[PDB]
Amino acid sequence: MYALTQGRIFTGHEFLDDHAVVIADGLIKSVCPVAELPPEIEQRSLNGAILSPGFIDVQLNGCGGVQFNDTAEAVSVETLEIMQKANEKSGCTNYLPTLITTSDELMKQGVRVMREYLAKHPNQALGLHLEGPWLNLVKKGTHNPNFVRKPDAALVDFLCENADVITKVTLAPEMVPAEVISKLANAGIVVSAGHSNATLKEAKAGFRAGITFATHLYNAMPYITGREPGLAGAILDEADIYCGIIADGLHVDYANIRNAKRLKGDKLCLVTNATAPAGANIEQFIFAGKTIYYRNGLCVDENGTLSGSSLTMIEGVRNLVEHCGIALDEVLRMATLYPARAIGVEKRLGTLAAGKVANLTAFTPDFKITKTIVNGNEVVTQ
Amino acid sequence: MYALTQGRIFTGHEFLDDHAVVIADGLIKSVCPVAELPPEIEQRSLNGAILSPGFIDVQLNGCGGVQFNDTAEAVSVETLEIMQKANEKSGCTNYLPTLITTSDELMKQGVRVMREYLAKHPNQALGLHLEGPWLNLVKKGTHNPNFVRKPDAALVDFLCENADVITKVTLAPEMVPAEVISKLANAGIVVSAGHSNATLKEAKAGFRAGITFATHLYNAMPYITGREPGLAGAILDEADIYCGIIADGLHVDYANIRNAKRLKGDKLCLVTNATAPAGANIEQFIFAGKTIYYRNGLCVDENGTLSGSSLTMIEGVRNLVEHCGIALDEVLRMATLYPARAIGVEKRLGTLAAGKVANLTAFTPDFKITKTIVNGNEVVTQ
Ligand SMILES: CP(=O)(O)N[C@@H]1[C@@H](O)[C@H](O)[C@@H](COP(=O)(O)O)O[C@@H]1O
Ligand SMILES: CP(=O)(O)N[C@@H]1[C@@H](O)[C@H](O)[C@@H](COP(=O)(O)O)O[C@@H]1O
Ligand SMILES: [Zn+2]
Ligand SMILES: [Zn+2]
């Protein structure tokens, strides 16, 4: 057992000074004044570093030089484990491996792989995020059109039956029957609107059917016009809908992120939507059946189409603070508590309180990771 | 002097019950509990109606069957007087006659006619609103393209010399040297961004140069995309910028109006941008050298291009309350206090307080005008 001391502790609700977090049995035992700490307990000094619950990334296609996409070879438990070690280097202790628009078979393997993974590693990769294939071609983005299709009773049923390892499914509401959304949500899956050209009216129908989240706000959505707010405008106008936003300063202009934060409040979540280049050093990689190039901080195919990002959660936190005028504590919530509540895991993750899983990360004022703790174990030490 | 009693009185800061507004010498003498009323003063009952500062419309091309545009014949003091009488019928006691993209000749005539009207009618038509001709053809809307032109140093200097009768000039910041903006602003003229295809970057440059207002948000502006917020996006992100919004449910979707209000706070002003059909009953009229038809409840030229509205201020107040979820008191401010502050006339108008000009309007809960008072005289009685 041990206690982390001498550092600013962010519980999710406030910053504490002169306190210590005692971690025992992979769980956070308590957070209280350092002066009430029993004697001889090994104290781990944070050395002034900020201590926060581990970041939670709800949209991640790949990182650490690998992708959990495209092939049966890459859609494996080993990939999941690799992506986890890479995330940890960036303070990210949890994520939703995201498998995009692909064949029925690859989706089934992804489900089997997720399930196998869960049995071996708890409180890490939390569950699958299936982005596709029920999208709108007009907003397919970098997805392979040969796989963008309409929903079948068989696939729909398979997902619902495997809801226990499927955290979320992103789909275009105007491309699927309301019944499909309701069925998925009733099974326990978070249904999110994304890669849609839906009008505001269509978007609202999707919300009423069971959609409670939206994938990477602005991206793969209609632009906003005076008379047609579209899905983006609808999400902004609907206080109950949570949503992710890629904060790399490349996918979305910081001004739109600021406007989005003001309008979404505690419902805006930080996501990386990263790819293999994130937390690694590579020049190119494969994605959506194409060759993607990492040229100038961008991940684009030969046609210049953005294909995911190379952003890490700690970099996202930093950008939101330095460029979007959002307080550190609020930014930390966008990367922890908010995404945790969006996917229903706040009872065990998202804050530094007694009983919660011991997943944390520590960084210095310059936003450099000094520690990362998974299930009470310090996997990163810098 | 006399007193208005028996009604809910909105001062611009609060709703008052059991109070009275005492009017003397065209000014509001006091707003106090009915118990402090001077002995034996005349008491005019509001019959339970709501009493408010008279509505101020900062963008109006025409109404009552006339237009303050297009021809040397129409640009007259008589038109201004006709428009004022029609406005009063819908609770609007003050407005800015808006002369759009036309020739140097007509503009100068507009300046002379305004000056002539001002020496004759105090506290009514406040001053000129020149919308154009330094706009972007991409966003000319219904404006005659043949007149959209670059800013001549001479014309600019002229406007500066006649700043005393020119309340506002709307221009596209990316089509004009920063100096033109600065000259006009320093001359006391409110410089507004409108009919522009400005990027967020070009818009901010405009604000730094002197722009403090934006004409009919969303309309004649770029749509909003993830990586290019454009002028509309920059306006929503800059708290210091005031802007008008056409609340007819026709020019801008109510969801966009709600998002804009949450982002602009006390900087969002209600405007009509109405034309001749407002407060009248016509099937067509001339505007921008074209025949405009009132089809399907819209003012459109033969090509379907929206060409102004047929909204009245009292109808706009109603729409904002019923379809935008904005409290009546806040909506009233959008039609009074806010626009008054935007054009710097709040020391004499915009609120019901001692010393302020006695311009007021009263209406029943169903938004029907019962009274309109200008300089202390009740000009509308219903
Ligand atoms: C794995 P993914 O989520 O599909 N990645 C998206 C791409 O498909 C889009 O092309 C890009 C731009 O979208 P845009 O609408 O052009 O802003 O945004 C994301 O990078
Ligand atoms: C007197 P005005 O201010 O010129 N009137 C504008 C028109 O020119 C535009 O065509 C219309 C639509 O603009 P839009 O960009 O299509 O929303 O909005 C206003 O009616
Ligand atoms: Zn996507
Ligand atoms: Zn206009």
Side-chain angles (χ1 to χ4, degrees):
Chain A
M1 182 196 275
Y2 68 83
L4 301 170
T5 62
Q6 299 190 60
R8 296 210 72 201
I9 300 169
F10 175 74
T11 76
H13 292 299
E14 58 186 310
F15 271 105
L16 297 173
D17 289 290
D18 306 297
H19 277 255
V21 177
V22 56
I23 296 180
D25 303 69
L27 300 175
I28 292 179
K29 192 173 183 57
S30 66
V31 181
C32 298
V34 61
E36 100 179 17
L37 276 180
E40 301 142 298
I41 74 302
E42 55 164 345
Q43 303 175 68
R44 311 290 183 68
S45 181
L46 297 164
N47 200 64
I50 291 175
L51 197 269
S52 152
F55 307 144
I56 309 178
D57 195 352
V58 297
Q59 176 164 43
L60 184 61
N61 313 286
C63 59
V66 301
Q67 291 270 297
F68 191 72
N69 276 282
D70 283 59
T71 71
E73 303 73 283
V75 179
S76 57
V77 51
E78 174 176 29
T79 294
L80 258 22
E81 305 179 315
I82 294 174
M83 288 174 69
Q84 170 76 190
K85 307 299 181 58
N87 286 343
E88 295 170 353
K89 309 294 183 60
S90 274
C92 180
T93 58
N94 302 89
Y95 72 106
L96 259 45
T98 309
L99 180 61
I100 75 175
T101 306
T102 184
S103 71
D104 279 6
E105 286 295 314
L106 195 286
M107 290 180 74
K108 295 180 184 301
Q109 187 181 310
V111 171
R112 293 192 295 275
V113 171
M114 192 68 254
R115 188 178 297 293
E116 297 187 6
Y117 176 95
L118 271 313
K120 185 179 167 189
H121 318 77
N123 315 306
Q124 276 148 287
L126 303 169
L128 282 173
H129 172 359
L130 300 174
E131 201 202 28
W134 312 322
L135 317 175
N136 185 314
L137 288 178
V138 177
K139 291 294 181 176
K140 63 179 191 298
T142 200
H143 289 217
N144 186 165
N146 303 143
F147 284 99
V148 174
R149 55 186 180 286
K150 293 173 175 52
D152 304 310
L155 203 189
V156 172
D157 291 342
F158 179 75
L159 300 191
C160 290
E161 299 177 308
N162 286 288
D164 62 323
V165 299
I166 295 173
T167 299
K168 174 207 293 170
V169 298
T170 292
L171 56 80
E174 81 283 5
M175 298 304 297
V176 63
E179 302 77 13
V180 176
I181 291 166
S182 298
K183 196 150 187 172
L184 284 174
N186 284 149
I189 300 172
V190 172
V191 187
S192 175
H195 293 274
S196 163
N197 193 218
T199 60
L200 173 128
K201 167 163 150 288
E202 286 166 344
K204 290 165 66 180
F207 300 146
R208 297 198 301 279
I211 289 178
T212 65
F213 200 101
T215 300
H216 50 57
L217 186 62
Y218 296 111
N219 302 131
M221 285 182 198
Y223 36 48
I224 305 174
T225 76
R227 294 179 283 292
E228 183 40 79
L231 170 63
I235 293 165
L236 285 167
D237 179 51
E238 190 54 83
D240 308 345
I241 307 297
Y242 278 93
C243 70
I245 189 156
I246 306 168
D248 61 358
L250 272 38
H251 277 78
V252 179
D253 187 276
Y254 288 128
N256 284 322
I257 296 185
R258 289 192 292 272
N259 291 337
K261 185 65 176 77
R262 299 175 185 123
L263 292 174
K264 299 305 301 170
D266 67 6
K267 298 301 188 303
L268 190 61
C269 305
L270 192 233
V271 302
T272 65
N273 188 44
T275 48
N281 168 186
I282 56 181
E283 311 169 301
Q284 60 185 69
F285 64 106
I286 300 76
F287 195 21
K290 309 173 294 182
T291 289
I292 307 300
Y293 306 75
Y294 176 73
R295 299 169 176 171
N296 291 165
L298 295 173
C299 290
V300 299
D301 63 15
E302 70 198 66
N303 301 303
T305 303
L306 276 186
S307 312
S309 82
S310 61
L311 187 289
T312 64
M313 292 301 277
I314 187 63
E315 297 185 318
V317 161
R318 182 197 65 211
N319 299 331
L320 285 173
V321 168
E322 309 189 315
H323 298 293
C324 303
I326 305 175
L328 180 58
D329 80 309
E330 182 63 9
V331 171
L332 258 39
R333 280 185 286 274
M334 297 183 274
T336 56
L337 179 63
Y338 299 170
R341 301 202 286 211
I343 61 173
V345 296
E346 76 277 8
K347 185 183 176 181
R348 57 193 262 234
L349 300 157
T351 58
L352 256 38
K356 303 304 178 195
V357 181
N359 278 19
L360 323 80
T361 186
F363 58 90
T364 54
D366 64 0
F367 293 101
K368 305 305 174 185
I369 311 301
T370 56
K371 290 186 181 300
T372 299
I373 300 174
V374 179
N375 286 304
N377 313 150
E378 189 172 307
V379 293
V380 175
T381 305
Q382 297 287 289
Chain B
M1 68 174 93
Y2 66 85
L4 295 166
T5 65
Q6 299 179 50
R8 301 210 71 209
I9 297 170
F10 183 65
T11 66
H13 290 293
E14 63 194 306
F15 261 105
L16 294 172
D17 293 286
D18 302 297
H19 282 237
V21 175
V22 174
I23 299 166
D25 296 350
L27 300 172
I28 286 175
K29 185 185 181 63
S30 61
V31 183
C32 310
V34 71
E36 308 189 314
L37 285 176
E40 294 179 297
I41 68 171
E42 194 197 332
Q43 281 179 282
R44 304 177 184 180
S45 178
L46 294 164
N47 193 195
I50 294 69
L51 215 212
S52 154
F55 307 146
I56 308 173
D57 193 357
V58 294
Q59 180 167 43
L60 179 63
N61 316 281
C63 60
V66 299
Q67 289 270 298
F68 189 71
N69 278 283
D70 281 49
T71 71
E73 306 83 72
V75 178
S76 60
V77 306
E78 182 179 0
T79 297
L80 251 30
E81 302 178 324
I82 291 179
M83 291 175 66
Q84 168 73 196
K85 296 278 87 183
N87 279 349
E88 287 166 357
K89 283 162 46 267
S90 55
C92 180
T93 61
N94 300 93
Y95 73 102
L96 260 38
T98 307
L99 179 60
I100 73 163
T101 305
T102 183
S103 63
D104 280 19
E105 299 68 61
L106 237 200
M107 284 170 82
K108 298 187 174 183
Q109 180 174 315
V111 170
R112 297 195 300 280
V113 170
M114 190 74 258
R115 181 180 302 294
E116 177 164 350
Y117 170 100
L118 266 31
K120 180 180 178 188
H121 301 277
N123 311 305
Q124 287 158 265
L126 301 170
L128 280 183
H129 173 0
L130 296 171
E131 201 201 30
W134 315 322
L135 316 178
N136 190 316
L137 288 172
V138 174
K139 297 297 186 180
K140 68 181 186 296
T142 202
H143 292 213
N144 183 316
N146 297 307
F147 278 119
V148 173
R149 55 176 179 291
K150 59 186 180 63
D152 303 304
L155 210 203
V156 178
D157 288 345
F158 182 74
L159 304 184
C160 298
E161 286 297 304
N162 286 282
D164 67 313
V165 307
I166 297 176
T167 303
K168 178 199 301 166
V169 294
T170 288
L171 52 67
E174 73 285 8
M175 304 302 297
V176 184
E179 287 45 73
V180 171
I181 292 174
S182 298
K183 298 181 187 63
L184 296 170
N186 296 170
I189 305 183
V190 172
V191 193
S192 177
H195 292 269
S196 162
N197 190 214
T199 59
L200 175 148
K201 192 165 176 291
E202 284 166 346
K204 289 167 66 187
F207 300 149
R208 299 196 303 274
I211 286 177
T212 58
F213 202 95
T215 298
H216 50 50
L217 183 66
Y218 294 115
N219 304 129
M221 298 185 177
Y223 37 50
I224 300 177
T225 81
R227 289 175 290 288
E228 184 39 78
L231 173 55
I235 291 162
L236 295 161
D237 182 44
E238 181 44 49
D240 301 340
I241 306 300
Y242 274 93
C243 68
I245 187 70
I246 301 173
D248 56 4
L250 278 4
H251 282 70
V252 183
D253 189 271
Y254 289 132
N256 281 328
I257 291 188
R258 290 194 291 276
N259 288 339
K261 185 65 179 71
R262 302 185 183 98
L263 285 172
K264 299 304 300 169
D266 65 7
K267 298 296 197 300
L268 190 61
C269 310
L270 193 235
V271 303
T272 68
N273 190 37
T275 56
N281 175 42
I282 62 176
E283 306 177 62
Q284 50 181 284
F285 59 106
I286 300 173
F287 194 19
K290 309 172 303 186
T291 294
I292 304 299
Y293 310 86
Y294 182 75
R295 292 168 174 172
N296 203 59
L298 297 176
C299 292
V300 299
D301 62 11
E302 55 183 37
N303 307 304
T305 301
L306 238 298
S307 309
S309 79
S310 58
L311 217 215
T312 60
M313 290 298 277
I314 184 67
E315 294 173 318
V317 164
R318 170 163 213 163
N319 295 334
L320 288 169
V321 166
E322 305 189 322
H323 302 296
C324 301
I326 300 170
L328 178 57
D329 67 314
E330 184 66 10
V331 171
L332 255 21
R333 279 189 281 277
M334 288 175 75
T336 57
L337 181 60
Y338 299 167
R341 301 205 281 217
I343 59 171
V345 303
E346 78 283 8
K347 189 176 175 300
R348 53 157 165 162
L349 298 163
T351 60
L352 259 35
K356 303 302 185 198
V357 172
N359 278 6
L360 315 79
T361 185
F363 54 90
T364 62
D366 68 4
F367 302 100
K368 297 297 165 299
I369 302 298
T370 52
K371 290 176 171 296
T372 299
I373 302 176
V374 179
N375 289 312
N377 315 99
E378 174 163 337
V379 293
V380 177
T381 306
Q382 299 286 167

Coordinates of all heavy atoms in Angstrom, one line a residue, chain A residues 200 218-219 223-227 229 233 236-237 250-253 255-256 258-259 262-263, chain B residues 200 218-219 223-227 229 233 236-237 250-253 255-256 258-259 262-263:
Chain A
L200 N -31.3 19.4 -38.9 CA -31.6 19.6 -37.5 C -32.8 18.7 -37.1 O -32.9 18.1 -36.0 CB -31.9 21.0 -37.1 CG -32.4 21.3 -35.7 CD1 -31.5 22.4 -35.0 CD2 -33.8 21.7 -35.7
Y218 N -18.6 18.7 -35.3 CA -18.2 19.4 -36.5 C -17.7 18.5 -37.7 O -18.1 18.7 -38.8 CB -17.2 20.5 -36.2 CG -17.6 21.6 -35.3 CD1 -17.1 21.7 -34.0 CD2 -18.6 22.5 -35.7 CE1 -17.5 22.8 -33.2 CE2 -19.0 23.6 -34.9 CZ -18.5 23.7 -33.6 OH -18.9 24.7 -32.8
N219 N -16.8 17.6 -37.3 CA -16.2 16.7 -38.3 C -17.2 15.7 -38.8 O -17.9 15.0 -38.0 CB -15.0 16.0 -37.7 CG -13.9 17.0 -37.3 OD1 -13.4 16.9 -36.2 ND2 -13.6 18.0 -38.1
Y223 N -22.1 21.7 -42.4 CA -21.7 22.9 -41.8 C -23.0 23.6 -41.3 O -24.0 23.1 -41.6 CB -21.0 23.8 -42.9 CG -21.6 23.7 -44.3 CD1 -23.0 23.8 -44.5 CD2 -20.8 23.6 -45.4 CE1 -23.6 23.8 -45.7 CE2 -21.4 23.5 -46.7 CZ -22.7 23.6 -46.8 OH -23.3 23.6 -48.1
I224 N -22.8 24.7 -40.6 CA -24.0 25.4 -40.1 C -24.4 26.6 -40.9 O -23.6 27.5 -41.1 CB -23.8 25.9 -38.6 CG1 -23.3 24.7 -37.7 CG2 -25.0 26.5 -38.0 CD1 -22.9 25.1 -36.3
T225 N -25.6 26.6 -41.4 CA -26.1 27.7 -42.2 C -27.2 28.4 -41.4 O -27.8 27.8 -40.5 CB -26.7 27.2 -43.6 OG1 -28.0 26.7 -43.3 CG2 -25.8 26.2 -44.2
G226 N -27.6 29.6 -41.8 CA -28.6 30.3 -41.1 C -29.9 29.6 -41.0 O -30.6 29.6 -40.0
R227 N -30.4 29.0 -42.1 CA -31.7 28.3 -42.1 C -31.6 26.8 -41.9 O -32.6 26.1 -41.7 CB -32.4 28.6 -43.4 CG -32.8 30.1 -43.5 CD -33.6 30.5 -44.8 NE -32.7 30.6 -46.0 CZ -31.8 31.6 -46.1 NH1 -31.6 32.5 -45.2 NH2 -31.0 31.6 -47.2
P229 N -29.4 24.5 -39.4 CA -28.4 24.2 -38.4 C -27.7 22.9 -38.6 O -26.6 22.7 -38.2 CB -29.2 24.3 -37.1 CG -30.4 25.2 -37.4 CD -30.8 24.7 -38.8
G233 N -25.6 22.0 -35.3 CA -26.4 23.0 -34.7 C -27.4 22.4 -33.7 O -27.6 23.0 -32.6
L236 N -25.6 21.4 -30.5 CA -25.3 22.6 -29.7 C -26.5 23.1 -29.0 O -26.4 23.6 -27.8 CB -24.7 23.6 -30.7 CG -23.3 23.4 -31.1 CD1 -22.9 24.3 -32.3 CD2 -22.3 23.6 -29.9
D237 N -27.6 23.0 -29.6 CA -28.9 23.4 -29.0 C -29.5 22.5 -28.1 O -30.5 22.8 -27.4 CB -29.8 23.8 -30.2 CG -31.2 24.3 -29.7 OD1 -31.3 25.2 -28.9 OD2 -32.2 23.7 -30.2
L250 N -6.3 21.3 -35.3 CA -6.2 21.0 -36.8 C -7.5 20.5 -37.3 O -7.9 20.9 -38.4 CB -5.1 19.9 -37.0 CG -3.7 20.3 -37.2 CD1 -3.2 21.5 -36.4 CD2 -2.8 19.1 -36.9
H251 N -8.3 19.7 -36.6 CA -9.6 19.2 -37.0 C -10.7 20.2 -36.9 O -11.6 20.3 -37.7 CB -10.0 18.0 -36.2 CG -9.4 16.7 -36.7 ND1 -8.1 16.3 -36.5 CD2 -9.9 15.7 -37.5 CE1 -7.8 15.2 -37.1 NE2 -8.9 14.8 -37.7
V252 N -10.6 21.1 -35.9 CA -11.6 22.1 -35.6 C -10.9 23.4 -35.1 O -10.1 23.3 -34.2 CB -12.6 21.6 -34.5 CG1 -13.6 22.7 -34.2 CG2 -13.3 20.4 -35.0
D253 N -11.3 24.5 -35.7 CA -10.7 25.8 -35.3 C -11.0 26.0 -33.8 O -12.2 25.8 -33.4 CB -11.4 26.9 -36.1 CG -10.8 28.3 -35.9 OD1 -11.1 28.9 -34.9 OD2 -9.9 28.7 -36.7
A255 N -11.8 28.5 -32.2 CA -13.0 29.4 -31.9 C -14.3 28.5 -31.9 O -15.2 28.8 -31.1 CB -13.1 30.5 -33.0
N256 N -14.4 27.5 -32.7 CA -15.6 26.7 -32.7 C -15.6 25.8 -31.4 O -16.6 25.5 -30.9 CB -15.6 25.8 -33.9 CG -16.1 26.5 -35.2 OD1 -16.9 27.4 -35.1 ND2 -15.5 26.2 -36.3
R258 N -14.3 26.8 -28.5 CA -14.7 27.7 -27.5 C -16.3 27.9 -27.5 O -16.9 27.8 -26.5 CB -14.1 29.1 -27.6 CG -12.6 29.1 -27.3 CD -12.0 30.5 -27.2 NE -12.0 31.2 -28.4 CZ -11.0 31.2 -29.3 NH1 -9.9 30.4 -29.0 NH2 -11.1 31.9 -30.4
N259 N -16.8 28.2 -28.7 CA -18.3 28.3 -28.8 C -19.0 27.0 -28.3 O -20.0 27.1 -27.7 CB -18.7 28.7 -30.2 CG -18.2 30.1 -30.6 OD1 -18.0 30.9 -29.8 ND2 -18.2 30.3 -31.9
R262 N -19.0 26.7 -24.4 CA -20.0 27.6 -23.8 C -21.4 27.0 -24.0 O -22.2 27.1 -23.0 CB -19.9 29.0 -24.4 CG -18.6 29.6 -24.3 CD -18.5 31.0 -25.0 NE -17.1 31.6 -25.0 CZ -16.4 31.9 -26.0 NH1 -16.8 31.7 -27.3 NH2 -15.2 32.4 -25.8
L263 N -21.7 26.4 -25.1 CA -23.0 25.9 -25.4 C -23.3 24.5 -24.8 O -24.4 24.1 -24.5 CB -23.3 25.9 -26.9 CG -23.5 27.2 -27.5 CD1 -23.6 27.1 -29.0 CD2 -24.7 27.9 -27.0
Chain B
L200 N -12.7 33.9 -40.3 CA -12.6 34.3 -38.9 C -11.4 35.3 -38.8 O -11.5 36.3 -38.1 CB -12.4 33.1 -38.0 CG -12.1 33.5 -36.5 CD1 -12.7 32.5 -35.6 CD2 -10.6 33.7 -36.3
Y218 N -25.7 35.7 -39.5 CA -26.0 34.5 -40.4 C -26.3 34.9 -41.8 O -25.8 34.3 -42.7 CB -27.1 33.6 -39.8 CG -26.8 32.9 -38.5 CD1 -27.5 33.2 -37.3 CD2 -25.8 31.9 -38.4 CE1 -27.2 32.6 -36.1 CE2 -25.5 31.3 -37.2 CZ -26.3 31.6 -36.0 OH -26.0 31.0 -34.8
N219 N -27.2 35.9 -41.9 CA -27.6 36.3 -43.3 C -26.5 37.1 -44.0 O -25.9 38.0 -43.4 CB -28.9 37.1 -43.2 CG -30.0 36.3 -42.5 OD1 -30.6 36.8 -41.6 ND2 -30.2 35.1 -43.0
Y223 N -21.3 30.3 -44.1 CA -21.9 29.3 -43.2 C -20.8 29.0 -42.3 O -19.7 29.5 -42.5 CB -22.4 28.1 -44.0 CG -21.5 27.7 -45.1 CD1 -20.1 27.5 -44.9 CD2 -22.0 27.4 -46.4 CE1 -19.3 27.1 -46.0 CE2 -21.2 27.0 -47.4 CZ -19.8 26.8 -47.2 OH -19.0 26.4 -48.2
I224 N -21.0 28.2 -41.3 CA -20.0 27.9 -40.3 C -19.5 26.4 -40.5 O -20.2 25.5 -40.5 CB -20.5 28.0 -38.9 CG1 -21.0 29.4 -38.6 CG2 -19.4 27.6 -37.9 CD1 -21.6 29.6 -37.2
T225 N -18.2 26.3 -40.8 CA -17.6 25.0 -40.9 C -16.6 24.7 -39.8 O -16.2 25.6 -39.1 CB -16.8 24.8 -42.3 OG1 -15.5 25.3 -42.1 CG2 -17.6 25.5 -43.4
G226 N -16.3 23.4 -39.6 CA -15.4 23.1 -38.6 C -14.0 23.8 -38.5 O -13.6 24.2 -37.5
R227 N -13.4 23.9 -39.7 CA -12.1 24.6 -39.7 C -12.1 26.1 -40.1 O -11.1 26.8 -40.0 CB -11.1 23.8 -40.6 CG -10.7 22.5 -40.0 CD -9.8 21.7 -40.9 NE -10.6 21.1 -42.1 CZ -11.5 20.1 -41.9 NH1 -11.7 19.6 -40.8 NH2 -12.1 19.7 -43.0
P229 N -14.6 29.0 -39.1 CA -15.8 29.6 -38.4 C -16.4 30.7 -39.2 O -17.6 30.9 -39.2 CB -15.3 30.1 -37.1 CG -14.1 29.2 -36.9 CD -13.5 29.2 -38.2
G233 N -19.0 32.9 -37.1 CA -18.3 32.2 -36.0 C -17.5 33.2 -35.1 O -17.5 33.1 -33.9
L236 N -19.8 35.3 -32.8 CA -20.3 34.5 -31.7 C -19.2 34.3 -30.6 O -19.5 34.2 -29.4 CB -20.8 33.2 -32.1 CG -22.0 33.2 -33.0 CD1 -22.2 31.9 -33.8 CD2 -23.3 33.6 -32.2
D237 N -17.9 34.3 -31.1 CA -16.8 34.1 -30.2 C -16.3 35.3 -29.5 O -15.6 35.3 -28.5 CB -15.7 33.4 -30.9 CG -14.5 33.1 -30.0 OD1 -14.7 32.6 -28.9 OD2 -13.3 33.3 -30.5
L250 N -38.0 33.0 -40.5 CA -37.9 32.8 -41.9 C -36.4 32.9 -42.4 O -35.9 32.1 -43.1 CB -38.7 33.8 -42.7 CG -40.2 33.5 -42.9 CD1 -40.6 32.2 -42.2 CD2 -41.1 34.6 -42.4
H251 N -35.7 34.0 -41.9 CA -34.3 34.3 -42.2 C -33.3 33.4 -41.5 O -32.3 33.0 -42.0 CB -34.0 35.7 -42.0 CG -34.5 36.7 -43.0 ND1 -35.8 37.0 -43.2 CD2 -33.8 37.4 -43.9 CE1 -35.9 37.9 -44.1 NE2 -34.7 38.2 -44.6
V252 N -33.7 33.0 -40.3 CA -32.8 32.2 -39.4 C -33.5 31.2 -38.6 O -34.5 31.6 -37.9 CB -32.0 33.1 -38.5 CG1 -31.0 32.3 -37.7 CG2 -31.2 34.2 -39.3
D253 N -33.1 30.0 -38.6 CA -33.8 28.9 -37.8 C -33.7 29.3 -36.3 O -32.7 29.8 -35.9 CB -33.0 27.6 -38.0 CG -33.8 26.4 -37.4 OD1 -33.5 26.1 -36.2 OD2 -34.6 25.8 -38.1
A255 N -33.3 27.6 -33.8 CA -32.2 27.0 -33.0 C -30.9 27.8 -33.1 O -30.2 27.9 -32.2 CB -32.0 25.6 -33.5
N256 N -30.7 28.4 -34.3 CA -29.5 29.2 -34.4 C -29.7 30.5 -33.6 O -28.7 31.0 -33.1 CB -29.3 29.5 -35.9 CG -28.6 28.4 -36.7 OD1 -27.8 27.6 -36.1 ND2 -28.9 28.3 -38.0
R258 N -31.3 30.7 -30.8 CA -31.1 30.3 -29.4 C -29.6 30.1 -29.1 O -29.2 30.5 -28.0 CB -31.9 29.0 -29.1 CG -33.4 29.1 -29.0 CD -34.0 27.9 -28.4 NE -33.9 26.7 -29.2 CZ -34.7 26.4 -30.2 NH1 -35.7 27.2 -30.5 NH2 -34.5 25.3 -30.9
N259 N -28.9 29.5 -30.0 CA -27.4 29.3 -29.8 C -26.8 30.7 -29.7 O -25.8 30.9 -29.0 CB -26.8 28.5 -30.9 CG -27.2 27.0 -30.8 OD1 -27.6 26.5 -29.8 ND2 -27.1 26.3 -31.9
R262 N -27.4 32.5 -26.3 CA -26.6 31.9 -25.2 C -25.1 32.4 -25.4 O -24.4 32.6 -24.4 CB -26.7 30.4 -25.3 CG -28.1 29.8 -25.2 CD -28.0 28.3 -25.1 NE -29.4 27.7 -25.0 CZ -30.0 27.2 -26.1 NH1 -29.4 27.2 -27.3 NH2 -31.2 26.6 -26.0
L263 N -24.6 32.6 -26.6 CA -23.3 33.0 -26.8 C -23.0 34.5 -26.8 O -22.0 34.9 -26.4 CB -22.8 32.4 -28.2 CG -22.4 30.9 -28.2 CD1 -22.1 30.5 -29.7 CD2 -21.2 30.7 -27.3

